[PDB]
Design a protein around this ligand. Structure first.
Ligand SMILES: NC[C@H](NC(=O)c1ccc(-c2cc(F)c(Cl)c(F)c2)[nH]1)c1nc(CO)c(CO)s1
Ligand SMILES: NC[C@H](NC(=O)c1ccc(-c2cc(F)c(Cl)c(F)c2)[nH]1)c1nc(CO)c(CO)s1
Ligand SMILES: *[C@@H]1O[C@H](CO)[C@@H](O)[C@H](O)[C@H]1NC(C)=O
Ligand SMILES: *[C@@H]1O[C@H](CO)[C@@H](O)[C@H](O)[C@H]1NC(C)=O
Ligand SMILES: *[C@@H]1O[C@H](CO)[C@@H](O)[C@H](O)[C@H]1NC(C)=O
Ligand SMILES: *[C@@H]1O[C@H](CO)[C@@H](O)[C@H](O)[C@H]1NC(C)=O
Ligand SMILES: *[C@@H]1O[C@H](CO)[C@@H](O)[C@H](O)[C@H]1NC(C)=O
Ligand SMILES: *[C@@H]1O[C@H](CO)[C@@H](O)[C@H](O)[C@H]1NC(C)=O
Ligand SMILES: *[C@@H]1O[C@H](CO)[C@@H](O)[C@H](O)[C@H]1NC(C)=O
Ligand SMILES: *[C@@H]1O[C@H](CO)[C@@H](O)[C@H](O)[C@H]1NC(C)=O
Length: 336
């Protein structure tokens, strides 16, 4: 028998001790090696109680990704306004596993269409999660895992427009971002196949209808707020990219290549909440990153319970929701 508990987890990874990349460096001294023979025990006739929006596992990943960025990504000016060293780095996230110490176990929901909250019929017990890459981004969830069957709408409270929505895709759409080798060093662009993106976006529209009484589904650009939230921001090879996602939410098409205009920025608002700092100028050459879009962060407009329209805008900024989208199927329990 077991009870719900919060505990201190430990991480594991396949960090190459030989490597210079900051995530390997970090994982080398912070995580143990992954179990080469991991076990998973199906619990027969067991139904358990999950809640992705209240899982302590998410607060502990957050704490780790902070520690990683604070030792890896050093700005040149920070805080008492300090000026320090900010050397260009090798940067490419690696998968991190989370594991329970003695006397505890992780329970896993295997229901193909589990939404992140409620009971789950097909449960197993494992010692570690799967490998999760700590990808920090807004608007679009990159390089995650995909839903196994249908698209999944996740939200702490659908009818409450203040709660963020996580759309979990079942089909990946590549986004391909380049700061060309050669001139404005800060100009970049992301290409997305519009045929692939618009088909999937229309699948989310029809999915959102099941949950919003077949009311009309409308997308719009974010009304305002932080640059970090009104644009798709993320880190590619150590450079901070800020991309304009207007064309991604073009209701007109719900057929060609979509090119988003992007800006590499040096003055950032730290998602760690540590303020505004200045990073180093970009490395020379073709800065390129190809990522899989595997989810979308949305906020529904308020004040439309009168109309038969429902508007959604790509949002985010709470980086913990990025960790939730991968830990939603797990929860820690204590064994007596
Ligand atoms: N301007 C306000 C400032 N916002 C941020 O720091 C912020 C949010 C999201 C990202 C972000 C996301 C990314 F994906 C990437 Cl790549 C990135 F580089 C940055 N940054 C805040 N300061 C406080 C302290 O009271 C706040 C309340 O908690 S919000
Ligand atoms: N106390 C609030 C906290 N203060 C700072 O961050 C801060 C003070 C001075 C500098 C500074 C000075 C420089 F000369 C250079 Cl070059 C630089 F890079 C940074 N930064 C903030 N947090 C957020 C959102 O995260 C803010 C909105 O920007 S202000
Ligand atoms: C339960 O989950 C396991 C692990 O993914 C899967 O192989 C199996 O098909 C599932 N069975 C049922 C009845 O849900
Ligand atoms: C998830 O499923 C539970 C159990 O049926 C339900 O109570 C909850 O409203 C669902 N949430 C969403 C966002 O569909
Ligand atoms: C994704 O899910 C939708 C339902 O939300 C379904 O119609 C579609 O066929 C699925 N696509 C794939 C590739 O599984
Ligand atoms: C969800 O939101 C609605 C509307 O904001 C509210 O009436 C309801 O109480 C909320 N549910 C919970 C469990 O807080
Ligand atoms: C990504 O786009 C660049 C152009 O910026 C192109 O050279 C490259 O072949 C693309 N990669 C993939 C995998 O499509
Ligand atoms: C875009 O995706 C469609 C499939 O939806 C494919 O048939 C087409 O060749 C793709 N085009 C490009 C330029 O990637
Ligand atoms: C994003 O692109 C649209 C279309 O060109 C433009 O109107 C808007 O001002 C851009 N947003 C920002 C923040 O530059
Ligand atoms: C996503 O994964 C690809 C493939 O490993 C990698 O090349 C790319 O840099 C990753 N993107 C981000 C933003 O981490």
């Amino acid at each position: 028998v077991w009870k719900d508990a919060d505990t201190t987890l430990f991480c594991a990874s396949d960090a190459k001790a030989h490597e210079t990349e900051v995530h390997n460096v970090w994982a080398t001294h912070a995580c143990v090696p992954t179990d080469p023979n991991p076990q998973e025990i199906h619990l027969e006739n067991v139904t358990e109680n999950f809640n992705m929006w209240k899982n302590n596992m998410v607060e502990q990943m957050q704490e780790d990704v902070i520690s990683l960025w604070d030792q890896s990504l050093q700005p040149c000016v920070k805080l008492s306004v300090i000026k320090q060293a900010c050397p260009k780095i090798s940067f490419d996230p690696i998968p991190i596993h989370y594991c329970t110490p003695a006397g505890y176990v992780i329970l896993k929901c295997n229901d193909k269409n589990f939404n992140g909250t409620g009971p789950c019929k097909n449960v197993s017990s494992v010692q570690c999660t799967h490998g999760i890459k700590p990808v920090v981004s807004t608007q679009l969830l990159l390089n995650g895992s995909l839903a196994e069957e249908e698209i999944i709408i996740r939200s702490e409270n659908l009818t409450n427009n203040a709660k963020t929505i996580i759309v979990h895709l079942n089909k990946s759409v590549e986004i391909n971002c380049t700061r060309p080798s050669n001139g404005d060093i800060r100009k970049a662009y992301c290409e997305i196949n519009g045929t692939k993106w618009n088909k999937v976006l229309k699948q989310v529209t029809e999915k959102l209808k099941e949950h919003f009484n077949n009311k009309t589904i409308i997308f719009q650009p974010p009304s305002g707020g932080d640059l970090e939230i009104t644009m798709h921001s993320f880190n590619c090879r150590g450079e901070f990219f800020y991309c304009n996602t207007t064309q991604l939410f073009n209701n007109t098409c719900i057929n060609g290549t979509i090119t988003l205009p992007c800006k590499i920025k040096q003055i950032i608002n730290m998602w760690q909440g540590t303020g505004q700092a200045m990073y180093a100028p970009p490395i020379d050459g073709k800065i390129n990153c190809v990522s899989n879009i595997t989810g979308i962060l949305l906020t529904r407009d308020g004040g439309a319970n009168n109309t038969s329209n429902e508007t959604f805008r790509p949002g985010g900024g709470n980086i913990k929701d990025n960790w939730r989208s991968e830990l939603y199927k797990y929860k820690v329990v204590q064994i007596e």
